[PDB]
Amino acid sequence: PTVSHLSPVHFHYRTDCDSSTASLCSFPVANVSLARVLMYGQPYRVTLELELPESPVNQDLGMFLVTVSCYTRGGRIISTSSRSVMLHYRSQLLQVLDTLLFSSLLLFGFAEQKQLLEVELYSDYRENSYVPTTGAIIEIHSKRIQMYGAYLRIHAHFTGLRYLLYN
Amino acid sequence: PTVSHLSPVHFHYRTDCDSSTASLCSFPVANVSLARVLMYGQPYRVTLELELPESPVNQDLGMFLVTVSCYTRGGRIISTSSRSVMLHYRSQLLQVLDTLLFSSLLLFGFAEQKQLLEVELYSDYRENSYVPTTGAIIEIHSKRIQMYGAYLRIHAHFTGLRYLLYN
Amino acid sequence: PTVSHLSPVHFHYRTDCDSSTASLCSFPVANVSLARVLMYGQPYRVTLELELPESPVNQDLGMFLVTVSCYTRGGRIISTSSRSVMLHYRSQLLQVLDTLLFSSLLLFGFAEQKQLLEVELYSDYRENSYVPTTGAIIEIHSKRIQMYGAYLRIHAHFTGLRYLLYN
Amino acid sequence: PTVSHLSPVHFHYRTDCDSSTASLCSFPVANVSLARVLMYGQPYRVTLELELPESPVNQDLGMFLVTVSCYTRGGRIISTSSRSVMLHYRSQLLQVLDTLLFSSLLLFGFAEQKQLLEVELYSDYRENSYVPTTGAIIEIHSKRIQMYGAYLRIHAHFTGLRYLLYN
Amino acid sequence: PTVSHLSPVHFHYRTDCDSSTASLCSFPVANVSLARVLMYGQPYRVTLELELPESPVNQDLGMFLVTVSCYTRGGRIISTSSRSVMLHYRSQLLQVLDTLLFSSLLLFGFAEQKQLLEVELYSDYRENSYVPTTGAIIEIHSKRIQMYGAYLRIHAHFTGLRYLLYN
Amino acid sequence: PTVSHLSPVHFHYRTDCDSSTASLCSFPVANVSLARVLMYGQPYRVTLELELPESPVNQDLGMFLVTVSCYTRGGRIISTSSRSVMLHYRSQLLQVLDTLLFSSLLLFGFAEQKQLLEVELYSDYRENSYVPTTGAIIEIHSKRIQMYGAYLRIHAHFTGLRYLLYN
Amino acid sequence: PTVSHLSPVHFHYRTDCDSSTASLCSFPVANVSLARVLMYGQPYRVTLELELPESPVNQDLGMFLVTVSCYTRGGRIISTSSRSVMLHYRSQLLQVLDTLLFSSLLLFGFAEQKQLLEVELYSDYRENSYVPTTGAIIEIHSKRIQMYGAYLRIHAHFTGLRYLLYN
Amino acid sequence: PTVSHLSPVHFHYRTDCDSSTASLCSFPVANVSLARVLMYGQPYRVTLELELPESPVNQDLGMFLVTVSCYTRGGRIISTSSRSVMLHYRSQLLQVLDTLLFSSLLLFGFAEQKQLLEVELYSDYRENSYVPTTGAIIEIHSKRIQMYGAYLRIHAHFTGLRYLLYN
Amino acid sequence: PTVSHLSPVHFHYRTDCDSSTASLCSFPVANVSLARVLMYGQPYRVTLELELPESPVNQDLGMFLVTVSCYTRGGRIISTSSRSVMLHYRSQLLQVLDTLLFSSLLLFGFAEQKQLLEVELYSDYRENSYVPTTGAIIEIHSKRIQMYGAYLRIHAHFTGLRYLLYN
Amino acid sequence: PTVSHLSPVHFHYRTDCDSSTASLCSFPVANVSLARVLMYGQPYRVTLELELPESPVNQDLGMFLVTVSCYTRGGRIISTSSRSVMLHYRSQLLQVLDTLLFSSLLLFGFAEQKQLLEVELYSDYRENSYVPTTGAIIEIHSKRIQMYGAYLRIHAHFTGLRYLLYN
Amino acid sequence: PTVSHLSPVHFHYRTDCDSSTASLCSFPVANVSLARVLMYGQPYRVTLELELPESPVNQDLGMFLVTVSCYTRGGRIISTSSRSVMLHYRSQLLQVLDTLLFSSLLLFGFAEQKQLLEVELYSDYRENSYVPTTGAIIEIHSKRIQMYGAYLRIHAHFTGLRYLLYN
Structure with missing residues (x-):
């Protein structure tokens, strides 16, 4: 086990246009x-x-810009942050080669044509005794993004040499 | 067996335009x-x-957004939920490979070119003593979706070791 | 034999535009x-x-929406129902494979490039003592639906072990 | 022989447009x-x-709609009927396959690229003592149909197992 | 020999447009x-x-419609008739196959790429004692009909077993 | 020799547009x-x-219409006639087959890609004692015809079985 | 030698547009x-x-029309004539075959891709005692005729058996 | 180790257009x-x-132009610099060859189709006793530059024989 | 040698549009x-x-017309002449065959893709005792010609059978 | 060593259009x-x-024109110069051949698809005792040039036969 | 050595539009x-x-036109000349063949896809005792001429047998 928790993000948006x-x-x-x-x-x-x-x-x-806005139990915004992320580029021939050689996994569902983008909105976030962290507002400033889901993963920074095992 | 009830959903809509x-x-x-x-x-x-x-x-x-609105026998809305779902992407070459290598099933009707999207609108739902659950309203906020049918599946969250049978 | 009657549907429509x-x-x-x-x-x-x-x-x-409207000998409408139906999708590569491997049936007239859609307007219908069923109005809310014909098939729901004869 | 008469239909239409x-x-x-x-x-x-x-x-x-209107010796219209008919669909690959394999008949005139459509406008037509059947008006409600000719074929419904001989 | 006379039709038309x-x-x-x-x-x-x-x-x-109009010596119209005739359809692959296989006749002039359409304007025609048949007006209601020539062929209806000589 | 004369026709036309x-x-x-x-x-x-x-x-x-108008020494028009003519159709594949197999004549000038059309404007023309035939006015009612030349040929109709020699 | 003289024609035209x-x-x-x-x-x-x-x-x-207008030493026009000529048609396949097989002459300059058109403006021309022929005006009624040069050729009509030297 | 520190740049921008x-x-x-x-x-x-x-x-x-603006703890701007940078050109054939031969690294994620551009905004920078460096504003004067991230890398200019470790 | 002189022509023209x-x-x-x-x-x-x-x-x-205008030392125009010249036509296949078989000369510069056009403006030019020939004005009446240079080659007409040596 | 110094040029320009x-x-x-x-x-x-x-x-x-403007310590312009330069032309086939036969260098970074253009703005520049050279302004009069960087190289003209070493 | 001097031309032009x-x-x-x-x-x-x-x-x-305008020390124009020049034509097939066979020189830089055009502005130029030659102005009357450079070359006309050293 490790000191961490996952809070999957459920994005919703308007539909009246x-x-x-x-x-x-x-x-x-x-x-x-x-x-x-x-x-x-x-x-x-x-x-x-x-x-x-x-x-x-x-x-x-x-x-496309991505922003996270943490806040307290009372809704007060403790801090604000922003990062820019972009889906990694892969040439059309590279994709075909990737699709072909990994056909044995994509067809059976073991692999899928998706990218996990690790937008690190905070390399060091510290708890304040007089201001507790209770929730986060997360945004993806683009009207053309297609996405399946997102996890807001937290973990204590102290990892040491064990960090290599996450590769 | 499973403690569950499948309430198949019959979507209807206007046609006068x-x-x-x-x-x-x-x-x-x-x-x-x-x-x-x-x-x-x-x-x-x-x-x-x-x-x-x-x-x-x-x-x-x-x-495209998908929303579920539970309500009681008296029509009162108990809780409102919303999720965003999308059909999974598969490259044209992958589809041609899927259509080919699985031809022996598609042609005889054992397989079909369709995706089951598991829109989970409630990971933990519980009953209220003073507010009974009687029915639900389910929506898919898109005028361009093509769909065959939908099942609203309710299942007790207790899985434990039984996941091996549900896998 | 089975306790059933087939009432083939003959659609007619206007032609002055x-x-x-x-x-x-x-x-x-x-x-x-x-x-x-x-x-x-x-x-x-x-x-x-x-x-x-x-x-x-x-x-x-x-x-496209398909609706059924039952009524009595006096014309009174007993119940109204609607179900959305859509022709099943088959890729262009799949169709060519079907046309080829099933050529021996398509050419000699034993097989044809058509689909039967089982629009189940009623899974549980029961006769009313004070309201007898006499006829039905059936609609297909689309101005572009190319079709050959349709049967309104009624059958007693008691299947039980007898499903093996239908499988 | 059979109890039947064939009355070939000679369609004529205006041409001043x-x-x-x-x-x-x-x-x-x-x-x-x-x-x-x-x-x-x-x-x-x-x-x-x-x-x-x-x-x-x-x-x-x-x-396209096809309508038949019977009438008496005095011109009075006895009954009106309408059935929608459509030319059966065959894929381009299938047609090329049909043309190739059935070349030996198409080239020598033993076969032709034509479809006989059996618009059964009456499965049970009964003669009336006070109203004799004399003639029919037949229509094809479309300005874009191309056709060679049409037979209006009548025959007693009593066939029994002998119907298989018409296959 | 046979009791018949062929009156070739010389279609002429205006050209000042x-x-x-x-x-x-x-x-x-x-x-x-x-x-x-x-x-x-x-x-x-x-x-x-x-x-x-x-x-x-x-x-x-x-x-395209084709009409015939018989008349007497005085020009009086005896009877009027009309039929619809269309050139028979043949697919491009079929046409290529015919041009190839029947090349030996087409090249040397023994065969030609033409269709004889037998517009039968009268299956039963009879002479009137007080009204003699003298000549006929014929028409083809189309401004786009490319044709080489036309024969108006009359023949006694009595064929009987003699059809074997025509088969 | 034979009882005939040839009067080659020299068409001329206006050129001011x-x-x-x-x-x-x-x-x-x-x-x-x-x-x-x-x-x-x-x-x-x-x-x-x-x-x-x-x-x-x-x-x-x-x-296109072709008309002939005979006239006397005084210019008086004796008779008028008209026959429609059209260049015979030959498919592109047939032409390529003709150009190839008859290349040995076309290249050396023994053959040419031309058609002779026999517009028989008169099957029986009779000389009149009171009206002598002196000259002819000939026409081709089309502004798009491309032609090399034209012969007007006269011959006594008495041929008999000798006609086969003209094949 | 022969009784003939060649008078090459040198066309000129305006260039102000x-x-x-x-x-x-x-x-x-x-x-x-x-x-x-x-x-x-x-x-x-x-x-x-x-x-x-x-x-x-x-x-x-x-x-395109071609006309010749002879005249006298005084400029008086003796006679007028006109003929219509056209470059002979050769298919694209034929031209390629002509270019290929006759390459040995075209490349070395012994042959050229050109046509001599013999516009015969006079099959029988006779000299008048009181009106001598001095010169001619020659025209080609077209603004799109690309040409290299033209000879006006005269020769005694008497050929007889001497045609063998011209064949 | 080396006398250096890395200050990764996190670009952010407006999103209201x-x-x-x-x-x-x-x-x-x-x-x-x-x-x-x-x-x-x-x-x-x-x-x-x-x-x-x-x-x-x-x-x-x-x-596109990239600029850097150093400044002090109090916000005072110490020095301003600008260098123009451009992604290196590589032909489509070269890219395909790179994608092909280096497939074994691109597919496993060891290589990626990216370029590191070394915009050397300062070849010789020195600290001022009365003016300390605290932070820097950086810019990329282009609205179309797709990028993953950037590092502002500072290093002591003393290389000497140590370049062998960097080659 | 021969009694001749070559007077190379240098065309100059306006360029201010x-x-x-x-x-x-x-x-x-x-x-x-x-x-x-x-x-x-x-x-x-x-x-x-x-x-x-x-x-x-x-x-x-x-x-395109080409004209030469001779004149005297006093500028007086002695005579005026004109001819029409055109670059000789060579099909694309012919040019490709020429470019191929004559590549050995074209590549080394011994041959070039150029045509010398011999516009003969005077087959017989006679000197006048009272009017000496001094200079010429030569024109090419086209704004789209591309040319390298031109020689006005004069030579005594008396050649006899020796003319064949100029081939 | 050689008597020379290289002063790299850092072009900067406006960006607010x-x-x-x-x-x-x-x-x-x-x-x-x-x-x-x-x-x-x-x-x-x-x-x-x-x-x-x-x-x-x-x-x-x-x-595209390129100009250099020398000037003194006080900014006074000593001399001005300009030379037009152009990237050398290489055909598409030549580029592909170069990209191919030199792949082993381009892929490993030993070669790059770039051209060094040596705009020699001064073949003989003399120092003036009363006017010292201190700095230069350099321009490239084009808004579409794409370039990596430029060196303004100065070298004593005394080279002799040693110039061959620069090949 | 030879009695000659090469004065390379440095074309400059305006760039304000x-x-x-x-x-x-x-x-x-x-x-x-x-x-x-x-x-x-x-x-x-x-x-x-x-x-x-x-x-x-x-x-x-x-x-395009090229002109040279010589002048004296005081600027007085001595003589003006103009010769029209054009780049020599080479078919695309010839260029491809040239690029291929001469690839070995082009790739190593020993050959280049450039044409040297000799505009002979003067074939006989002589010095005047009362008017000395000091400088020249040279022009190329076209706004689309892409060029690398130009030399104005003078040489004593006396060549005689010495041409063998220049051939």
Whole structure:
């Protein structure tokens, strides 16, 4: 075991526009409930492992800002952060080679044509005694992103040489 | 056996517009009657397994919101939930490979070019003594979705070692 | 033998508009006379097996609503029902494989490129002592549905072990 | 021999319009003289076997309505009927396969690329003592149909096991 | 020999229009002089064998009406008749196969790419004592019908067993 | 020798328009001097053998009317006649097969890609004692015909079985 | 030797327009000096052998009129004549075969892709005692005729057995 | 180890425009905090290693300007610099060869289709006694630069024989 | 040697227009100084050998008039002449065969894709005692010609059988 | 060692236009500090070796003027110069052959698809005792040039036979 | 050695306009200093060897004018000349063959795809005692000429047998 918890992010968005294309109405957003893993003074790592398929719409998407806004039990925004993430580029021939050689896994469902993007919104987050962390608002500032789901993973920074096992 | 009840969902919608395109008129909606499997205190898992073909119109559909609205015998809404689901991406070469190597099943009807999307609208649902669950309203906020049918599956969350049989 | 009667449906529709396209003029509707297979209390299964060719126009058709309206000898409407049906998708590579390997049946007329859609408008139908069933109106809310014919098949729900004869 | 009479239908139509395309000016119609094969009480089968070539124009035609209107010696219309008919769909690969294998008949004139469509406008037509059947008006509500000719075939419904000989 | 006379039809038409296209200016028409083969009481078969090349312009022509108008020495119209005739369809692969296999005849002029259409305007024609048949007006209601020539062939209806000589 | 004379026709036409395309100003026409081959009472055959290349412009030409107008020494018109003619259709594959197998003649000039059309404007032309035949006016009612030349040929109709030698 | 003289024709034309196209400005024309070969009473043959390339511009040219206008030393026009000539049609496959097989002459300059068109303006020309022939005006009524040069050729009509030297 | 510190840059930008294109709303900008490695007198090399994928959007980008703006703890700007950088060009054939031969690394994630651009904004930087370096603002003056991340790498200019460890 | 002199022509022309295409401002012209080859009474041959490349712009050029205007030392124009010249046509297949088989000369510069056009402006030019020939003005009436240079080659006409040596 | 110094040029330019294409706001420019290599009286060679990739945008660039402006310590301009330079042309086949036969160097980074253009702005530059050279301004008058960097290289002109070592 | 001097030409031109195309802004010009090689009375050959790449833009350039304007020490213009020059045409097949066979030199830089054009502005130039030659102005009247450089070359016309050293 390890000192960590996963809070999957359930993005929702508005749907009242024309919607005559593959473009959503409003920017995806979400609340998350963090209600210990956090301890006073200790820095913690907060990331949003985000699951993007390699569908053609996503390749043409380009960069898009991602922001996280932590807050307290009373809703007060403790801190704000932002990072830019982009689906990694792979050439069309490379994709075909990847699809071919990994056919034995993709066909049986052991592998899938998706990318996990590790947007590290915090390399060192520390608990405040007078201001407790209770939940997070997470956003993906783009109306054309296609995604399956996202996890807000927290873990104590102290890992040592054992970090190599996560490769 | 399993302590569960499958309430198949029959989506209906309006049809009075011009309708000169594959796009429909109004947002698909449904009303399902849940009338025990539910018991007080016990958490329950509510999911809508959605049967989408891999037709080209669906691959270009993009993300689309799905919402479930539970309510009582008197119509009062107990709780409201929403999730976003999308048909999984598969490259054209992969599809040609899937269509070929699984031809022996598709041709004889043992397999079909369709995806079951497990929209989990409630990972832990529990019954209220003063507010009984009687029915649900289920929506798919898109005028371009093509679907065959949907089951609202409720199952007691206790799995334990029994997962080996459900895998 | 089986306790059933087949009431083939003969759709008719208006023809006075411009009609300069494969799209018809008005919504296909039909009337069918049910004049006993029905008995008080016993549940009955009412379905409309719909014969759709796999012609290209039908594959781009998309979903379309099919509604049934039962009524009495006096014309009073007993109940109203609706189910959405869609022609099953088959990739272009799959169709060519079907056309090829099943050529020996397609050419000699033993097989044809058509689909039967089992639109089950009623899984539990029962006769009412004060309201006798006499006939039904059946509709297919689409101006582009190419079809050959349809049967409204009623059958006693008691199957039990007898399903093996139907399998 | 059989108790039947064939009354070939000679469709004629107006031609004063622009006629700048392959679309006729007015709806095909016809009069036919049925002047016994009909006898009182017995129901009879009336069909219009319609000879449509498989030319590309006809495949894109889509559905079209065919109506038969019987009438007496005095011109009074006895009954009106309508059945929708469509040319059966065959894929381009299948047609090429049919053309290749059946070349030995198509080239020498023993076979032709045409479909006989059996519009059964009456499965049970009964003669009336006070109203004799004299003639019929037959229509094909489409300006884009291409056809060679049509027979209105009548025959006593009493066939029994002998019907298999018509296969 | 046989009791018959062939009166070749010389279709002529006006030409003072714009004529900037393959379409003619006015409807083809013709007079033909029949002045015996016709005798009182005996039925006669009157047909117009029409020589249409299988050119692309003719295949896209579609159906076209053909009318015949008999008349007396004084010009009085005896009877009027009309039929619809269409060039028989043949697929491009079939046409190529015919051109290839029957090349030996086409190249040396023994065969030609033309269809004889037997527009049978009268299956039973008889002479009237007080009204003699003198000549006929014939028409082809189309501005796009490419043709080489036409024979109006009359013949005694009595064939009987003699059809074997014509088979 | 034979009782015949040839009067080659020299068509001339106006040239004052824009002429920005392959379309001539006015309908080709001509005068021909017929001044014996003609004898009183005897009917004679008059034809115009017309030399048309198989150039693409001519294949798209379609039907065109050709008229002949005989006249006397004083210019008085004796008779008028008209026959429709059209270059015979030959498929592209047939032409390629012709160009190939007959290359040995076309290349060395012994054969040419031209068609002779025998417009038999008169199957029986009779000389009149009171009206002598002196000259002919000939026409081809089309502004798009491409032609090399034309012979007007007259010959006594008395041929008998010797006609086969002209094959 | 032969009783003949060649008077090469040198066409000239105007050049004042925009000339933004391969089409020329004005109709080609030319004078020629015939100043004996001509003798009184004797018929003579006057022809213009016209050297046209087989360039694409010429094949789309179509027919074009050619006229010759003889005149006297005083300029008085003795006689007027006109003929219509056209470059002979050769298919694209034939031209390629001509280019290939006759390469050995075309490449070394012994052959060239050109046609000599023998526009015979006079089959029988005779000299008049009171009116001497001095020169001729020659025209080619087209603005799109690409040509290298032209000879006007005269020769005594008497050929007889001497044609063997010209065949 | 070496006398150096890395200060990764986290660019953020506005997201309120239409954003219906791969172009971003505003110029990428960033703020980086440097709070020693810097010492008085000693020259230092400040560079921004920038991680650009080889995606087609970036190849068409063309030259873009990158600027750095150092400043103190109080915000006072110490020095301003600017260098223009561009992604290196590689032909489509070269890219395919790179993708092919280096497939064994790209597929397993050991290699990726990205370029590190060493924008050396300062070859000789030295600390000021009265003005301390605290942080730097960095920019990329282009709305279309797709990038993963960047490091502001500082290192003592003293290399000498130690370059062998960096080669 | 021979009694001749070559007076190379240097064409110069205006250049002040927009010149946004491959078309020149004004008609090429030039003066040439002829200052004995000429002798009184004797007719002489004057030609302009014109060096046109076979570039596509020249093949589509079509005909173009070329004129020479001789004049005296006083500028007085002695005589005026004109001829029409055109680059000889060579099919694309012929050019490819030429470029191939003559590659050994083209590559080494011994042969070049150019045509010398011998525009013979005077087959017999006679010197006048009272009017001496001094210089010439030579023109090429086209704004789209591409040329390298030109020689005005004069030579005594008396050649006899020796003319064959010039081949 | 050699009597020379290299002063790399760092072009900077404005960036506040629309910038919707691969074009820049203003002409590239730069200052450079030349602060001995220069000596009085001796003329010196000054050049700008310019590193241009062979990317397609640069090939379509065409010529572009380059200017150098020397100046003194006080900023006074000593001399001005300009030379036009252009990236060398290499055919598509040649580039592919180079990309292929030199793959072993391009892939490993030993070679790159770039061209060094040696714009020699001064073959003899002499130092003035009363006017010292201190710095230079260098420009590239094009908004579409793509370049990596430029060196302004100075070297004493006294080379002799040793110049061959620079090959 | 030889009595000659090469005065390389450095073309400069304006750059103020939009310049959004490969076409330059103003006519290329130059000024060259000629400051013995020239001696009184002796003829001299003055030429401009112009280095043009075979780039596609230059092939479509077409003919253009080049002029040289000599002048004295005081600027007085001594003589003006103009010769029209054009890049030599080479078919695409010839270029491909040239690129292939001469690849070994092009790849190593021993050969280049460029043409040296010798514009012989003067074949006989002589010095005037009262008017000395000091410099020249050279122009290339085209805004689309892509060029590398140009030498103005003078040489004593006396070659005689010495041409063998230059062949």
